Design a protein around this ligand. Sequence first.
Ligand SMILES: CCCCCCCS[C@@H]1O[C@H](CO)[C@@H](O)[C@H](O)[C@H]1O
Lengths: 67, 67
Amino acid sequence: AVCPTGLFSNPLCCATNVLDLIGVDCKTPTIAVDTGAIFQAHCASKGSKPLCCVAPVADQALLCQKA
Amino acid sequence: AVCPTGLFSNPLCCATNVLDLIGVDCKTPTIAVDTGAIFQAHCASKGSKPLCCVAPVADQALLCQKA
Ligand SMILES: CCCCCCCS[C@@H]1O[C@H](CO)[C@@H](O)[C@H](O)[C@H]1O
């Protein structure tokens, strides 16, 4: 997968990050993200970072880890 | 690598985990853990899980993410 299983299992595209534990301005991908390269490329095309977060939906500030 | 870069970049072998945010009874690897398979096997040989943690030191309870 592109994220580990467990709490931090949801791939999101986030505008930025804080201390590799929080994602800021996070949105769900608009494609299936089958590989890490594709996840990174998809988010990058929107200016965002590919993070693995605790929720599968968009929000302004989330617990997220680096992919 | 076996851990992302950033704050949670330190591979440790931890006896257990809590909420994919805490590693419990963590120790540094005693061999080089240069691939995910080697990391997993090494930690498993001590009954432990391969976690990516915020410090490169043995510690009983610290911030760690799933690899
Ligand atoms: C938002 C929390 C960010 C976590 C940073 C962990 C860096 S690891 C460890 O953390 C100790 C506190 O538990 C600090 O006293 C010590 O200086 C630091 O090296």
